[PDB]
Write a protein that binds this DNA or RNA. Structure first.
Ligand code: MG
Ligand code: MG
Ligand code: MG
Ligand code: MG
Ligand code: MG
Ligand code: MG
Ligand code: MG
Ligand code: MG
Ligand code: MG
Ligand code: MG
Ligand code: MG
Ligand code: MG
Ligand code: MG
Ligand code: MG
Ligand code: MG
Ligand code: MG
Ligand code: MG
Ligand code: MG
Ligand code: MG
Ligand code: MG
Ligand code: MG
Ligand code: MG
Ligand code: MG
Lengths: 242, 96, 173
RNA sequence: AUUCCGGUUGAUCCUGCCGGAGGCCACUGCUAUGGGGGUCCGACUAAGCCAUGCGAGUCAAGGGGGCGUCCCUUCUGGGACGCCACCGGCGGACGGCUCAGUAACACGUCGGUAACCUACCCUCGGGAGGGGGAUAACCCCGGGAAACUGGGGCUAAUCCCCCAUAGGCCUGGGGUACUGGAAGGUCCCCAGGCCGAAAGGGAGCCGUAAGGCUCCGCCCGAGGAUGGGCCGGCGGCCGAUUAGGUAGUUGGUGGGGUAACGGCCCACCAAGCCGAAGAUCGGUACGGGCCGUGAGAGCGGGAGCCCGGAGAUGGACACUGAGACACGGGUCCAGGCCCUACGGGGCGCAGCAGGCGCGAAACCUCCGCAAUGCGGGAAACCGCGACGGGGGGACCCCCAGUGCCGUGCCUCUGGCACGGCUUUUCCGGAGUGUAAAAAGCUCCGGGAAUAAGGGCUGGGCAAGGCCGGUGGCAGCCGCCGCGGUAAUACCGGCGGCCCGAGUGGUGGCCACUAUUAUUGGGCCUAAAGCGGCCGUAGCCGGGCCCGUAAGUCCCUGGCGAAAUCCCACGGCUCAACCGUGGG
C-alpha cells in the first residue's frame, strides 16, 4: 500500500479465527466492509463451500448465492464477500435448517444448530449511545447497526446492556441489564467460550479498561474484560448455547 | 470387478445426488468409465443420460479403486451447472 | 532472515577412520544385509532421538511433561520395542540391534517367507509381500506390532501358490 | 561424544601458535539408472544497455448511430435478431519486480488521537420540485513525410449548468439532554453571515387503457466497518590517529498554512538546546519474523517464503482523483540512443520470455484461464506472463535399482560351471489420469536381460616391506617431511582401504580454542603491574531497631500475526510433505 488501499489477501496472512487450509493455495478472499470486524467474522463464500459443503468450486457457490438461497438475519445476501459474525443467524429455508455463529473454545468460528422458534431473535450488545437531532437517542450496537428511541425511554438503556431484537423486522422485545447475577458468555481472550454469572466489577484510573469476575457452574472464579462479557439472560440463558 | 456404494448424499440446492463408491478388482486393470457407468446405473435404476462420473482413481499397491459420481434430476440443470470439459470427457456431448 | 531448508535425517561419524567403530559397523552391515552405511546411520539416529527424549523428561516436572512421558511410552511399546509393563527407565537400555530387528526385511526372513536376508530384500522390492492387505516395497519400513501377523505373500503373486518351484525350495528349509 | 592427535630437544617438562579430524553455503574436476515432495535457479561484479511479442480491462438492463438477417403491412415504415465503433460509468493508486538510498520514530513492541481523512460495503432517519446547454459518433472539404491535427452541418443521455428547498461551516449570547477517567465534542433556543444536493433514471409482467407489482439504481444526515496519516516511552552496529557542536538553533507570545497537532513557516521577545553515561563528524548497512553452528553460555548471517520501508536512467515539479506528485499517464534540465522528405518527431524491461555486456558465477522468445483470487457486470459471463501446467538444470530432502536360489570346484570373502526363479528398473500395448497433454498408478506380452564411479595407500589416519621405470633430476608435500643408482612416500602395473549415484579441488562462517575467558584465562624468571604518590566521577562498602515498597519473589487480567521448531494421532504405499490437537 504505497499509493492506496489493499485489495488482496494472502492465505498465510489470513485471520486466525477461520477454518481454512493455509498452504493449499496462494490467495484468500478479502472480505468486504460490513457489519462486524475482521477478527470476529468470516466471508459467506467459505460458509457455503468449506463449512457446510454445498458446493465444490467457487463458481457454483456463486450460482447458489445469486438465486437467493441463504438468509442472514432474515435478509437475502448475494455477495460472496459479505461478512458473517458472532451471534448471527444463518438460515436455509429450502432445506429448513438454522445455525448460530459462535466462537469455539480455542477461538475459531463454528455453526451451532438451533430451532426455528429461536431463529427469529438476535441478541445485540449496546456499544454506545448518543443524542441525535430532534433530541432523540441513537443506540449503536456491537455489530454496527443502529436504532432510535424517544427521549422518554432514555433511562432504560445503558452501555453493556443487551437488547433482544426480532429479525428481520427489527423490533425490540426484551432488555437485559448488566449487573450482579447476570448470565454472561465470553467472546474473546484466554477465557473465550466460557459462561457464567457476574460477581464483581472493578474500575481503574486514566482510561484503563474495567474488569469483571465470573463464577461458572462448578464454582470456579475467573476474570475478564468488561467488554468481552456478553449478557445472555437474567439467571438462565435466553438462547441455546454449547 | 465388484462395486460397493459407500455414501449417497442429497443436495436440494443444486438439485442432484452425490455418490461415492469403491471397486474391488484383484488381477485386473482399472475399470473403464463405460463399464462403471453401466453397472452404477443398473444397481441404482437411474437414467443414464443424466449421470456423470467425476473420477476413478487407483492407488499404489491396492486391489481397489475409488470413484465419485453425480446424478442430476433434469438435463437442463446438468447442462447449466457442470463445466463443458467434464461433459465432453464423459461422452455426454460432442466437442466443437 | 532466511526461509526453511530441509535437513538430513541422519548423522555422520565424527572421525571417518577409527578402527573399532569400523569393525563393529562391518559386523552389523554383514549380518543384516544393508546397502550402505547411511542406511545404518539412519537407524542409529532414531535410537539416539529416543534416548535424548528420555533423558530430558526424567529431569522435568509439570503438566505437559507427564503427557509427553506417557506419549513416549505408548509410542515405544506400539512399535514392539518394549513390553507392555515397561517404565521410563527401560528406555535407556535399548540397543541398535533392537531397532534393526523391526525392519520389514528382517521380519520377512524370520517368519520363514524367505531362506535368506537377500532373498527377502528382493521379495519385498519386486512386490511379492503384502502387509495388512497392502503392498509395501520399502525394505526399511518399521513394522508395528499390531500388524505383524498379517504379513503374507501378495494374493496376485506367483509365490501365492503352494506348488511354485521357488516357494517349495523355501519351504524345504 | 561436554574428546583430542602431529610439529621447538641428543633426550625432558612447559608456554604458545600453525596443521589435521566435523557441519553448512558459493564456484569448479571427473562420473551418473529411477521415482516422489518442496517456500531452489542473472542476489554478490553493471540500480549497466536493450530489437520483437505479450504483462488491465469491462458494462448492449446509461445513450444516440452504422451494417446484416427475417416478419407485418410495406410506395414510406414499424418490428424482432445479431454485430461494430463512439459518447458515458467503474477500474487502471492493487497485483508483479529490485534492494540503490537511508544510522532515521526506518523497523519491533506497548500505548495515544478529546489533534485527522476515507470511493466501494452495513444499519437506521429523510429527499428526488422547475428550467437551460453544448458536443463525439454521423455528412462536406481537408493539412502534414510521418507523429499528429483544422473549418463548416446536425444529434442524445444516469453528460454539463442554473433556480428553489433540505443541508454544511464560522462567531457572539443563553440552557444543561448524552458519552466518558476527564469535554475546545454531541443535543435545545435566539442572533449576524458565507457556501450550497439529487437520475423516479433503466428492465420485466399484469395492464384495453388508466396504474400497479417486483428487479437494479440517484442525493443529504448520524454511526460503524475497511484502508491509512500523525505522536510518544522502551529495544537492537564499528571508530577518540574524530572534542566540542548548534544561530530557526532551544523555548515564549501573536499569526499563517494544513485533512489534522507541531519552528511546519513568518513577525516580535529572550539565551537557550546537545555532550567523555561519547555529542558532532566519518565508515558500513534496508528492519524484523527467522537461518547456520555449538553440550550449553555464546559466536556469525539476514537474497528466495510472510509482514513493514523505499525506487522506476540521475535531479527537480505539477494535472486528475476518495486515494498519486503515478513503472506499461504529463513538463523541464543533464546524459545516452532511434526515425526523417531535414521542416520535425519519438524511446529508457530493477514485469514474463529473449539478446548483448560484465564476470568464477545463473533456464523456454512454451500451453491455459479448468483450479485459487482480483477488476467489471442484474446475471450468464469476459480479461489477467498474478496464479496454475509443463520444458532446461549433479539446488535441497525422502524411498529404490544395478539380480536371487540350489549343487559342485576354486586362491573358499569372492570367482567359475551347471539347473531353476523373479521383473522394481528397461522395450511394446489397453485403461485411468489431465483444461488438453506428459508423468504417475492398475493390468497384459518379451527377457538377467538395459545400468559403477571418485579419492586414498610413510605418520596424523583405515589400507603393500610386492614388481618395473627415474637417480638432489623429474616430481610429491594442508603440517611433519620424501627423492644423492638397493625409493613401502615420485611415475606406472598388480593387489588393498574408505565412502558410494556420487566422490575430490578452491574460497567463506561456526566448532576445534579456557587462542576473548559472565559461566571460565593470564601478568617473579615465558607476552603482560603505570618510576612513585595524592585525589574528582564511577564501582564496592561495618553492627542493631522502626517505616516504606523502587529493585526482587508469588498469584492473576490484556498482548507479543501466520509460516518456521518439538510431540501424539490421522491422509498420500511408509516416508519427505500435508491436516486436527497439545506445547
Ligand atoms: Mg531480509
Ligand atoms: Mg626451546
Ligand atoms: Mg532473486
Ligand atoms: Mg543486474
Ligand atoms: Mg503500485
Ligand atoms: Mg546497499
Ligand atoms: Mg443550490
Ligand atoms: Mg543488519
Ligand atoms: Mg531469461
Ligand atoms: Mg550456479
Ligand atoms: Mg602406486
Ligand atoms: Mg594404520
Ligand atoms: Mg585452529
Ligand atoms: Mg594462556
Ligand atoms: Mg610498579
Ligand atoms: Mg616496571
Ligand atoms: Mg587514590
Ligand atoms: Mg551492612
Ligand atoms: Mg516492587
Ligand atoms: Mg507465531
Ligand atoms: Mg496409507
Ligand atoms: Mg505417519
Ligand atoms: Mg501443517
Amino acid at each position: 500500500a504505497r499509493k492506496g488501499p489493499k485489495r488482496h489477501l494472502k492465505r498465510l496472512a489470513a485471520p486466525t479465527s477461520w477454518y481454512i487450509e493455509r498452504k493449499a493455495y496462494k490467495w484468500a478472499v478479502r472480505p468486504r466492509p460490513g457489519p462486524h470486524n475482521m477478527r470476529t467474522s468470516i466471508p459467506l463464500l467459505y460458509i457455503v463451500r468449506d463449512y457446510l459443503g454445498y458446493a465444490k468450486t467457487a463458481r457454483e457457490a456463486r450460482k447458489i448465492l445469486n438465486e437467493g438461497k441463504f438468509l442472514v438475519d432474515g435478509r437475502v445476501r448475494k455477495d460472496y464477500k459479505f461478512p458473517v459474525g458472532i451471534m448471527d443467524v444463518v438460515s436455509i429455508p429450502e432445506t429448513g435448517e438454522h445455525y448460530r455463529v459462535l466462537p469455539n473454545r480455542i477461538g475459531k468460528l463454528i455453526l451451532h444448530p438451533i430451532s426455528e422458534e429461536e431463529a427469529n431473535i438476535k441478541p445485540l450488545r449496546i456499544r454506545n449511545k448518543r443524542m441525535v437531532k430532534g433530541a432523540k437517542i441513537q443506540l449503536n450496537f456491537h455489530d454496527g447497526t443502529n436504532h432510535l428511541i424517544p427521549l422518554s425511554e432514555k433511562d432504560n438503556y445503558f452501555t453493556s446492556y443487551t437488547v433482544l431484537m426480532k429479525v428481520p423486522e427489527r423490533e425490540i422485545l426484551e432488555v437485559l441489564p448488566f449487573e450482579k447475577g447476570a448470565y454472561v458468555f465470553v467472546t474473546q481472550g484466554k477465557n473465550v467460550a466460557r459462561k457464567g454469572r457476574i460477581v464483581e466489577i472493578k474500575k481503574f484510573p486514566m482510561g484503563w479498561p474495567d474488569v469483571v469476575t465470573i463464577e461458572d457452574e462448578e464454582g470456579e472464579l475467573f476474570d475478564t474484560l468488561k467488554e468481552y462479557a456478553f449478557v445472555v439472560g437474567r439467571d438462565k440463558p435466553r438462547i441455546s448455547l454449547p | 470387478m465388484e462395486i460397493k456404494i459407500t455414501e449417497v448424499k442429497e443436495n436440494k440446492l443444486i438439485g442432484r445426488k452425490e455418490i461415492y463408491f469403491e471397486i474391488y478388482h484383484p488381477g485386473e486393470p482399472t475399470p473403464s468409465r463405460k463399464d462403471v457407468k453401466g453397472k452404477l446405473v443398473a444397481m441404482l435404476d437411474l437414467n443414464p443420460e443424466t449421470t456423470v462420473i467425476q473420477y476413478i482413481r487407483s492407488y499404489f499397491g491396492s486391489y481397489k479403486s475409488k470413484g465419485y459420481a453425480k446424478y442430476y434430476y433434469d438435463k437442463d440443470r446438468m447442462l447449466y451447472i457442470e463445466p463443458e470439459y467434464i461433459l465432453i470427457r464423459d461422452g455426454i456431448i460432442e466437442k466443437k | 532472515g532466511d526461509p526453511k531448508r530441509q535437513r538430513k535425517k541422519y548423522e555422520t561419524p565424527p572421525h571417518p577412520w577409527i578402527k573399532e567403530r569400523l569393525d563393529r559397523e562391518r559386523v552389523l552391515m554383514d549380518k543384516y544385509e544393508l546397502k550402505n552405511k547411511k542406511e545404518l546411520w539412519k537407524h542409529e539416529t532414531q535410537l539416539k532421538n529416543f534416548r535424548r527424549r528420555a533423558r530430558r523428561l526424567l529431569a522435568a516436572r509439570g503438566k505437559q511433561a507427564e503427557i509427553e512421558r506417557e506419549q513416549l511410552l505408548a509410542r515405544l511399546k506400539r512399535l514392539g520395542l518394549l513390553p507392555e509393563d515397561a517404565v521410563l527407565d527401560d528406555v535407556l537400555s535399548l540397543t541398535i540391534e533392537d531397532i534393526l530387528e523391526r525392519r520389514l526385511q528382517t521380519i520377512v526372513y524370520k517368519k520363514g517367507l524367505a531362506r535368506t536376508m537377500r532373498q527377502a530384500r528382493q521379495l519385498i522390492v519386486h512386490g511379492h509381500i503384502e502387509v495388512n492387505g497392502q503392498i509395501i516395497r520399502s525394505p526399511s519400513y518399521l513394522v508395528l506390532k499390531e500388524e505383524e501377523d498379517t504379513i503374507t505373500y501378495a494374493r496376485t503373486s506367483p509365490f501365492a501358490n503352494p506348488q511354485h518351484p521357488e516357494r517349495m525350495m523355501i519351504e524345504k528349509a
